Amino acid sequence: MRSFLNLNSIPNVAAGNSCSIKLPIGQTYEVIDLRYSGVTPSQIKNVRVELDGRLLSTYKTLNDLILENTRHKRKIKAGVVSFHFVRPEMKGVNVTDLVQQRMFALGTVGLTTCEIKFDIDEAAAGPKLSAIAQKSVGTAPSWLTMRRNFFKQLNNGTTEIADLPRPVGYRIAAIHIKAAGVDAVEFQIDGTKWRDLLKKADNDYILEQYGKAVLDNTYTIDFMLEGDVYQSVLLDQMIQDLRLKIDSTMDEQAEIIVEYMGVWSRNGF
Amino acid sequence: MRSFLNLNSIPNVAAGNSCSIKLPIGQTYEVIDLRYSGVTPSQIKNVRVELDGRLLSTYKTLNDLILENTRHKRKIKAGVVSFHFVRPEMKGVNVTDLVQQRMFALGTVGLTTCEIKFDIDEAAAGPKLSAIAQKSVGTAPSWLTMRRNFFKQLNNGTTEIADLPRPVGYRIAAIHIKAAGVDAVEFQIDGTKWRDLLKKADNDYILEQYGKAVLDNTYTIDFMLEGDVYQSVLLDQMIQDLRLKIDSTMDEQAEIIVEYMGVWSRNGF
Amino acid sequence: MRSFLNLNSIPNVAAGNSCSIKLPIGQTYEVIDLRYSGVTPSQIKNVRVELDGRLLSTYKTLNDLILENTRHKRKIKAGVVSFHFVRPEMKGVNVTDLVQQRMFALGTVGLTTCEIKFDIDEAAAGPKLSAIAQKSVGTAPSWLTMRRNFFKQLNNGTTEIADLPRPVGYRIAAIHIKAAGVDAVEFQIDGTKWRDLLKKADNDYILEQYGKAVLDNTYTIDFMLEGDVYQSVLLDQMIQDLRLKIDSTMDEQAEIIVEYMGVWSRNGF
Amino acid sequence: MRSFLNLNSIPNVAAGNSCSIKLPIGQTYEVIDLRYSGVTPSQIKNVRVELDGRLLSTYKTLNDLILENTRHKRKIKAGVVSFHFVRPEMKGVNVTDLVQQRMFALGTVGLTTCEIKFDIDEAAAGPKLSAIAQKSVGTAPSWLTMRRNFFKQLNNGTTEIADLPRPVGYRIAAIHIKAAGVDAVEFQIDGTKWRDLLKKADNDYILEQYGKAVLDNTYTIDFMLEGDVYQSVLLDQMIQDLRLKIDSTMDEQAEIIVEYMGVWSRNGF
Amino acid sequence: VPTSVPTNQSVWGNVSTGLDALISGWARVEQIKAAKASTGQGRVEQAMTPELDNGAAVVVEAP
Amino acid sequence: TPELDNGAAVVVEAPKKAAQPSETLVFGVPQKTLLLGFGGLLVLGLVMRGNK
Ligand SMILES: [Ca+2]
Ligand SMILES: [Ca+2]
Ligand SMILES: [Ca+2]
Ligand SMILES: [Ca+2]
């Protein structure tokens, strides 16, 4: 049996304020529903999920969480944005789908602090935020999704990005290139071309082919289209080159979103 | 390695409001830089540094903190005022200067609450306050500077102040007599005249002789001119009389500032 | 007792010429005073301090040495520029200040060659250069400051620099970002944010707070503000990420100055 | 704890009079602040510091004491001149800076008489002199600074001075050549050139480089620029030649000031 | 024994008994901090510690 | 005692009492241990009868 709780009131919710959603340790958080009003998702900046003071996932703005859910075609409702720790799209290969989905839940056992920090923009009309938690029996943080942010200059022609962090033992579920002039992209590991120079139209077709929604000004490289976790990139310690070849038509600054995965460690990634 | 952090936003910063700078427990605070605008230092009243709800240091107004720093000839910048817990002027006798200076840092280990409370004047134009922390590895509160406020009547002639608190085991770094008509002062302990009836001009000359700046309408009795902590007044549990003989020319109420020192105790001074 | 010597005449001092200050091996060079006339400090390009043919420190122009001294508020005189091997700002933690400062002196014992090479610009009016040496008893090169030059392009937005050399066992005293449009910078090691995204005004305030002078079009990250060498960045081998997040307002190429430190080695950095 | 005392009234202070500041024996005098009015420092001639009737330090006029303090950049105030027995510029090598500075304090233990004699010029308008003493616990005279006066004829060309007293076991902190036409000076001991023929501009640059102020018509040879007492000249009994080679441009009478140092002895230097 | 008297006293108590014993302890802990800073393992230990509010817990059910 | 908005709570069910399982085990092992004692005391008692 699951428990649906109305989380404690969020302290000091005001424009230009730096608030935090401190989660009580002991149980497992499958989903966290954040209700907002008097403020836009884009006005909720620097969203950081921290476990024991360490960063787990980061969102430039709350709007990126809305887009994250939209991509998987999850239920979207105005005035509310959810933190899906449990991945509903997961499919089991040697275990049940339910086990593969729940495995991403945010367990808090052994933790000292679990927080969701963020800053409220100064322009916020009259910010009002509350949270509801869909919890289950306590478990260690264990297997978690680690959303990381990266910024890189994209040229008009060809750009290559090979300096992406490769935490050992971790995996990569997907890579999102946020740019308006990306025509095609190619992904390779150690010379091996796992993703040919696929045109945007072709890449976006495959994405939609798997029930995903294409995000505006984004080139998504989904390594878990089938929902199988073992299709994602396994960051082996021996990998010598993890490269991305981007064919752009514009000279701009791209925000590269990398969805990492791995067993949470107090002194790990 | 030290860590420079942009402290969390100060809640409810407005004219006539009572705000507080709640410091996170765990590490050591060497210096706290408070940026202000839309308000004068004199408009930031009743500044209190509290450890576990108890009073450590007190400032009638933020301007007294500016004067405290000015006296030691510390870097002063408009729009910013720092809380120097670590005393940069300290000199070691049997230890290094660095050890003697850092020994005053605000350790928070074992603490339940660390706060810097203050009241914003109603006349404040458009108060705006933020804080930055220069921290280091965690330590117990230990040796701290305890600025205390006292108000006493001065006569035109000779006034004597012998009712100053004498917390056992504690020390006195300095005494600041805030009055406009003080000509000369004499300090004695148990009949012994440690400071002869020194004329203001003579006392102020010795102060400047040690790199200190003379404050307006203030007679400072610096017991740590050399930076040696062992030169300060040791409040021996055996002292029978701690007296101050003030020769004034005006009949006014003086604000006596006493800079105490000692190992912070949950049930101490 | 120290010895002040008028170094041998500098051979072939003329415009467009490549000269060198060959130092006699045997003793220790604490300071080298270089007198110049008929030429500007900016006209003395590619200044290199070489020990046994290997590069120790490098200056794009002699003006960078003038700025290096200005930053520490060292005595600056027109027509003369000094090479401060001994760091006067050093403070001892478990040793005397004098020992900590002299430890940076340029010992020459065991050396085959000690040189200070540089090129005289062609536009030089009538170059005239002489040098004086403040020496002391001979010592091995030992602990030395190794000024390194790096050029990186900056965007208008955020730029990240994580490819800075990390010689094992060495330390980093400071990092100077030479750019005209830097608003704020953030420094982190292995995810740990040792320096929050500090605004220039805030960073510069802390610098001045420690007796340092802010250099024009430069964002200095001083890791030895207190003079304590053990506050500097220890380039520990297990370090996986040494990153710099620069928030600029201009699209330019910055000159990154890194002040390394370590025991000089025939086969080291 | 130190004691600040208003010394007894100076007997017979009048123009053309020979007065004396008789110091009470028992404690240690770190500093003596002499307030003057109705007379110029140059009008206070033949200042002699005598211990047990023997001469310790000598000043042609009180103005030389003002210049002595100015050179070290000590606090100078009109109407007051201090006798700094404790040397604030001292830095410890194997002891703390404080110990190295206080070691020069004027201890009086074992003394029969401690006096500061001087003559008041006849032209003195209306001489008024008082003194304040900054004392500490009693100690033997011990290590003291012994300022000695010497007069020698300087030629236009080259002059050599090798007849300077060399009290065995004593040291030389500095040598001040008071002449208006000195271009360069060279210092050597037993043929060894410890100070090359340094041009005034070059010598003065090094002086300022160490926080010292250059005195008018003076060529200072500071042997304690770092504040290290062990950098001074140690007058070994074996020294065969202590020479000074002065390159002047004028034919004049120079006043050579020699700052000696050593453990005070009732029958010593 | 305590006594009251004017004038600068000839001999004063220059004893810093219990305060010096404490001051040495502060000097000792400074060397411990420096011992950590001299190695890379000392910096990584300090990275684990944050400064935040207190944490609560709650649980029920039969596993 | 101060006033802050920072508390560390721990509200949870707790079990009480336990009878029968530890007993049954702690009655089995000593009864056997006692029975071994009687066997030793019997053979010592019976051998004394042989020495009559
Ligand atoms: Ca999990
Ligand atoms: Ca402390
Ligand atoms: Ca060295
Ligand atoms: Ca002495």
Curated annotation (Swiss-Prot), chains A, B, C, D:
User: What Gene3D superfamilies does UniProt report for this protein, alphabetically?
Assistant: 2.60.120.730
Keyword list, A-Z: Capsid protein, Virion
**GO cellular component term of the entry, any:** viral capsid, major subunit
Q: Which residues form a coiled coil?
A: none
Pfam families with a match to the protein in the record: P2_N
Compartments in which it is found? Virion
What job does this protein perform?
Major capsid protein.
Query: What does the annotation say about its assembly with partners?
Result: Homotrimer.
Protein name per the record? Major capsid protein P2
Q: Which organism is it from?
A: Pseudoalteromonas phage PM2
Q: Which gene encodes it?
A: II
Curated annotation (Swiss-Prot), chain F:
> Can you tell which superkingdom this protein's organism belongs to?
Viruses
Localization annotation:
Virion membrane
> Which cellular component terms (GO) are annotated to the entry?
membrane; viral inner membrane; virion membrane
The alphabetized UniProt keywords are:
Capsid inner membrane protein, Membrane, Transmembrane, Transmembrane helix, Virion
Its topology with respect to the membrane?
A: Single-pass membrane protein
Question: Which stretches are transmembrane?
Answer: 25-47
Q: How does it assemble?
A: Homodimer.
Descriptive protein name: Protein P3
Q: What is the scientific name of the source organism?
A: Pseudoalteromonas phage PM2 (Bacteriophage PM2)
> What gene is behind this protein?
III
Q: Which residues of the full protein are shown?
A: 53 to 104 of 104
